[PDB]
Amino acid sequence: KETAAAKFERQHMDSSTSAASSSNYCNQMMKSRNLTKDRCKPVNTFVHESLADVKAVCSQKKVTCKNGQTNCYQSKSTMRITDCRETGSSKYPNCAYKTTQANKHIIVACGGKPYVPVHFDASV
């Protein structure tokens, strides 16, 4: 039922908060977004910007993706993001993450019609 675009939103978009304060944001969010249900996703980034702002990135700087494709775009300015990295002591079913907040340019792959982000590639 879930499309590639809805999936990118569930995995990376948090337009509710602007900052990932509380070292427990990742622990909470990785679980609520269903990223720990079948395994502990080792790494994941959440973007604290409006949907409209992240969607606009597909019309910004075209750059190569990490895998070599060329359907990736880099955001004009930095954006508020949260890095979630599994800790050395995390173990499925009890995944545990370290929350890291930063302001970086994000790179995403876009596709479809409407043309929207469908994959989070990297942050620079």
Coordinates of N, CA and C in Angstrom, one line a residue:
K1 N 0.8 -1.2 0.0 CA 0.0 0.0 0.0 C 0.9 1.3 0.0
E2 N 2.0 1.2 0.8 CA 2.9 2.4 0.9 C 3.8 2.5 -0.4
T3 N 3.8 3.7 -0.9 CA 4.6 4.0 -2.1 C 6.0 4.5 -1.7
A4 N 6.9 4.6 -2.7 CA 8.3 5.0 -2.5 C 8.3 6.4 -1.8
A5 N 7.4 7.3 -2.2 CA 7.4 8.6 -1.7 C 6.9 8.6 -0.2
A6 N 5.8 7.9 0.0 CA 5.3 7.8 1.4 C 6.4 7.2 2.3
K7 N 7.1 6.2 1.8 CA 8.1 5.5 2.5 C 9.3 6.5 2.9
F8 N 9.7 7.3 2.0 CA 10.7 8.3 2.3 C 10.3 9.2 3.4
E9 N 9.0 9.6 3.4 CA 8.5 10.4 4.5 C 8.5 9.7 5.8
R10 N 8.0 8.5 5.8 CA 8.0 7.7 7.1 C 9.4 7.5 7.6
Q11 N 10.4 7.2 6.8 CA 11.8 7.0 7.2 C 12.6 8.2 7.5
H12 N 12.3 9.3 6.9 CA 13.2 10.5 7.1 C 12.6 11.9 7.4
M13 N 11.3 12.0 7.4 CA 10.7 13.3 7.7 C 10.1 13.5 9.0
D14 N 10.6 14.6 9.7 CA 10.0 14.9 11.0 C 9.8 16.4 11.1
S15 N 8.7 16.9 10.4 CA 8.4 18.3 10.3 C 7.6 18.8 11.6
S16 N 7.6 18.0 12.6 CA 6.9 18.3 13.8 C 7.9 19.1 14.7
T17 N 9.0 18.6 15.0 CA 10.0 19.2 15.8 C 11.0 19.9 14.8
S18 N 11.8 20.8 15.3 CA 12.8 21.5 14.5 C 14.2 21.0 14.9
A19 N 14.3 20.5 16.2 CA 15.5 20.0 16.7 C 15.3 18.7 17.4
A20 N 16.3 17.8 17.3 CA 16.2 16.5 18.0 C 16.8 16.5 19.4
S21 N 16.4 17.4 20.2 CA 16.9 17.5 21.6 C 16.5 16.2 22.3
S22 N 17.1 15.9 23.4 CA 16.8 14.7 24.2 C 17.6 13.6 23.4
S23 N 18.6 13.0 24.1 CA 19.4 12.0 23.5 C 18.6 10.7 23.2
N24 N 17.3 10.7 23.6 CA 16.4 9.6 23.4 C 15.5 9.7 22.1
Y25 N 15.6 10.8 21.4 CA 14.8 11.0 20.2 C 14.9 9.8 19.2
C26 N 16.2 9.4 18.9 CA 16.4 8.4 18.0 C 15.8 7.0 18.4
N27 N 16.0 6.7 19.7 CA 15.4 5.5 20.3 C 13.9 5.5 20.1
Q28 N 13.3 6.6 20.4 CA 11.9 6.7 20.2 C 11.4 6.7 18.8
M29 N 12.0 7.6 18.0 CA 11.6 7.7 16.6 C 12.0 6.4 15.7
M30 N 13.1 5.8 15.9 CA 13.4 4.6 15.1 C 12.4 3.5 15.3
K31 N 11.9 3.4 16.5 CA 10.9 2.4 16.9 C 9.5 2.8 16.3
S32 N 9.1 4.1 16.6 CA 7.8 4.6 16.1 C 7.6 4.6 14.6
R33 N 8.7 4.8 13.9 CA 8.7 4.8 12.4 C 8.8 3.4 11.8
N34 N 8.9 2.4 12.7 CA 9.0 1.0 12.4 C 10.3 0.6 11.7
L35 N 11.4 1.2 12.2 CA 12.7 0.9 11.6 C 13.5 -0.1 12.5
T36 N 12.8 -0.6 13.5 CA 13.5 -1.6 14.3 C 12.7 -2.8 14.4
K37 N 11.5 -2.9 13.7 CA 10.6 -4.1 13.9 C 11.1 -5.4 13.3
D38 N 11.9 -5.4 12.3 CA 12.4 -6.6 11.7 C 14.0 -6.7 11.7
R39 N 14.6 -5.7 12.3 CA 16.0 -5.7 12.5 C 16.3 -4.3 13.0
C40 N 17.5 -4.0 13.5 CA 17.9 -2.7 13.9 C 18.5 -2.0 12.7
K41 N 17.9 -1.0 12.2 CA 18.5 -0.3 11.1 C 19.7 0.3 11.8
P42 N 20.9 0.1 11.2 CA 22.1 0.7 11.8 C 22.3 2.2 11.8
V43 N 21.8 2.8 10.8 CA 21.9 4.3 10.6 C 20.7 4.8 9.9
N44 N 20.3 6.0 10.3 CA 19.1 6.7 9.7 C 19.2 8.2 10.1
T45 N 18.8 9.0 9.1 CA 18.8 10.4 9.3 C 17.3 10.9 9.2
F46 N 17.0 11.8 10.1 CA 15.6 12.4 10.0 C 15.9 13.9 9.7
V47 N 15.0 14.5 8.8 CA 15.1 15.9 8.4 C 14.0 16.7 9.1
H48 N 14.4 17.7 9.8 CA 13.4 18.6 10.5 C 13.1 19.8 9.7
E49 N 12.4 19.6 8.6 CA 12.0 20.7 7.7 C 10.6 20.3 7.2
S50 N 10.0 21.3 6.6 CA 8.6 21.1 6.1 C 8.7 20.2 4.8
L51 N 7.7 19.5 4.5 CA 7.6 18.6 3.4 C 7.9 19.4 2.1
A52 N 7.3 20.6 2.1 CA 7.4 21.5 0.9 C 8.9 21.8 0.7
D53 N 9.6 22.1 1.7 CA 11.0 22.5 1.6 C 11.9 21.4 1.1
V54 N 11.7 20.2 1.5 CA 12.5 19.0 1.1 C 12.1 18.6 -0.3
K55 N 10.8 18.8 -0.7 CA 10.3 18.4 -2.0 C 11.0 19.3 -3.0
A56 N 11.2 20.6 -2.7 CA 11.8 21.6 -3.5 C 13.2 21.3 -3.9
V57 N 13.9 20.4 -3.1 CA 15.2 20.0 -3.4 C 15.4 19.3 -4.8
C58 N 14.3 18.6 -5.2 CA 14.3 17.9 -6.5 C 14.4 18.9 -7.7
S59 N 14.4 20.2 -7.4 CA 14.5 21.2 -8.4 C 15.7 22.1 -8.1
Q60 N 16.6 21.6 -7.3 CA 17.8 22.3 -7.0 C 19.1 21.8 -7.7
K61 N 20.2 21.6 -6.9 CA 21.4 21.2 -7.6 C 21.5 19.7 -7.9
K62 N 21.6 19.4 -9.2 CA 21.7 18.0 -9.7 C 23.1 17.5 -9.4
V63 N 23.3 16.4 -8.8 CA 24.6 15.8 -8.5 C 24.6 14.3 -8.6
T64 N 25.7 13.7 -8.7 CA 25.8 12.2 -8.8 C 25.4 11.6 -7.4
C65 N 24.7 10.5 -7.4 CA 24.4 9.8 -6.2 C 25.6 9.0 -5.8
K66 N 25.6 8.5 -4.5 CA 26.7 7.6 -4.0 C 26.9 6.4 -4.9
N67 N 25.8 5.8 -5.5 CA 25.9 4.6 -6.3 C 26.3 4.9 -7.8
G68 N 26.4 6.2 -8.1 CA 26.8 6.5 -9.5 C 25.7 7.0 -10.4
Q69 N 24.4 6.8 -10.0 CA 23.3 7.3 -10.8 C 23.4 8.8 -10.8
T70 N 22.6 9.5 -11.6 CA 22.7 10.9 -11.7 C 21.4 11.6 -11.4
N71 N 20.4 10.9 -10.8 CA 19.1 11.4 -10.5 C 19.1 11.9 -9.1
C72 N 20.2 12.4 -8.5 CA 20.3 13.0 -7.2 C 20.4 14.5 -7.2
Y73 N 19.9 15.1 -6.1 CA 19.9 16.6 -5.9 C 20.4 16.9 -4.5
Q74 N 21.2 18.0 -4.5 CA 21.7 18.5 -3.2 C 21.0 19.8 -2.9
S75 N 20.6 20.0 -1.6 CA 19.8 21.1 -1.2 C 20.7 22.4 -1.2
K76 N 20.1 23.5 -1.6 CA 20.7 24.8 -1.7 C 21.4 25.2 -0.4
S77 N 20.7 25.1 0.7 CA 21.3 25.4 2.0 C 21.3 24.3 2.9
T78 N 21.9 24.4 4.1 CA 21.9 23.3 5.1 C 20.5 23.2 5.6
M79 N 20.2 22.0 6.2 CA 18.9 21.8 6.8 C 19.1 21.1 8.1
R80 N 18.1 21.3 9.0 CA 18.2 20.7 10.3 C 18.0 19.2 10.2
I81 N 19.0 18.4 10.6 CA 18.9 16.9 10.5 C 19.3 16.3 11.9
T82 N 18.8 15.0 12.0 CA 19.2 14.2 13.2 C 19.8 12.9 12.6
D83 N 21.0 12.6 13.1 CA 21.6 11.4 12.7 C 21.4 10.4 13.8
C84 N 20.9 9.2 13.5 CA 20.6 8.1 14.4 C 21.6 7.0 14.0
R85 N 22.5 6.6 14.9 CA 23.5 5.6 14.7 C 23.3 4.6 15.9
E86 N 23.3 3.3 15.5 CA 23.1 2.3 16.5 C 24.3 2.3 17.4
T87 N 24.2 2.0 18.7 CA 25.3 2.0 19.6 C 26.0 0.6 19.6
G88 N 27.2 0.6 20.1 CA 27.9 -0.7 20.1 C 27.3 -1.8 21.0
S89 N 26.4 -1.4 21.9 CA 25.7 -2.3 22.8 C 24.2 -2.6 22.3
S90 N 23.8 -2.1 21.2 CA 22.4 -2.3 20.8 C 22.3 -3.7 20.2
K91 N 21.2 -4.4 20.5 CA 21.1 -5.8 19.9 C 19.6 -6.1 19.8
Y92 N 19.2 -6.5 18.6 CA 17.9 -6.9 18.2 C 17.4 -8.0 19.1
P93 N 16.1 -7.9 19.6 CA 15.1 -6.8 19.4 C 15.2 -5.5 20.2
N94 N 16.3 -5.4 21.0 CA 16.5 -4.1 21.7 C 17.5 -3.2 21.1
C95 N 17.1 -2.5 20.1 CA 17.9 -1.6 19.3 C 18.1 -0.4 20.2
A96 N 19.3 0.2 20.1 CA 19.6 1.4 20.9 C 20.4 2.3 20.0
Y97 N 20.1 3.6 20.0 CA 20.7 4.6 19.2 C 21.3 5.8 19.9
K98 N 22.3 6.4 19.2 CA 22.9 7.7 19.7 C 22.3 8.7 18.8
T99 N 21.8 9.8 19.3 CA 21.2 10.9 18.6 C 22.2 12.0 18.3
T100 N 22.3 12.4 17.1 CA 23.3 13.4 16.7 C 22.6 14.4 15.9
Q101 N 22.6 15.7 16.3 CA 22.0 16.8 15.6 C 23.0 17.6 14.8
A102 N 22.6 18.0 13.6 CA 23.5 18.7 12.8 C 22.8 19.6 11.8
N103 N 23.5 20.4 11.0 CA 22.9 21.3 10.0 C 23.8 21.0 8.8
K104 N 23.3 20.3 7.8 CA 24.1 19.9 6.6 C 23.2 20.0 5.4
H105 N 23.9 20.0 4.2 CA 23.1 20.0 3.0 C 22.7 18.5 2.8
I106 N 21.5 18.3 2.4 CA 21.1 16.9 2.2 C 21.1 16.6 0.7
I107 N 21.3 15.3 0.4 CA 21.3 14.9 -1.0 C 20.3 13.7 -1.1
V108 N 19.4 13.9 -2.0 CA 18.3 12.9 -2.2 C 18.1 12.5 -3.7
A109 N 17.6 11.3 -3.9 CA 17.3 10.9 -5.3 C 15.8 11.1 -5.4
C110 N 15.4 11.7 -6.6 CA 14.0 12.0 -6.9 C 13.6 11.1 -8.0
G111 N 12.2 10.9 -8.1 CA 11.7 10.1 -9.2 C 10.2 10.2 -9.2
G112 N 9.6 9.7 -10.3 CA 8.2 9.6 -10.4 C 7.6 10.9 -11.0
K113 N 6.2 10.9 -11.0 CA 5.5 12.1 -11.5 C 4.2 12.1 -10.7
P114 N 4.0 13.1 -9.8 CA 5.0 14.2 -9.5 C 6.4 13.7 -9.1
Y115 N 7.4 14.5 -9.4 CA 8.8 14.3 -9.2 C 9.0 14.6 -7.7
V116 N 9.2 13.6 -6.9 CA 9.5 13.9 -5.4 C 10.6 13.0 -4.9
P117 N 11.1 13.3 -3.7 CA 12.3 12.5 -3.2 C 11.8 11.1 -2.9
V118 N 12.5 10.1 -3.2 CA 12.2 8.7 -3.0 C 13.3 8.0 -2.2
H119 N 14.4 8.7 -2.0 CA 15.5 8.0 -1.3 C 16.5 9.1 -0.7
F120 N 16.9 8.8 0.5 CA 17.8 9.7 1.2 C 19.2 9.2 0.8
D121 N 20.0 10.0 0.2 CA 21.3 9.6 -0.2 C 22.5 9.9 0.7
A122 N 22.6 11.1 1.1 CA 23.7 11.5 2.0 C 23.5 12.9 2.5
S123 N 24.3 13.3 3.4 CA 24.2 14.7 3.9 C 25.7 15.2 3.8
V124 N 25.9 16.4 3.3 CA 27.3 16.9 3.2 C 27.5 18.2 3.9

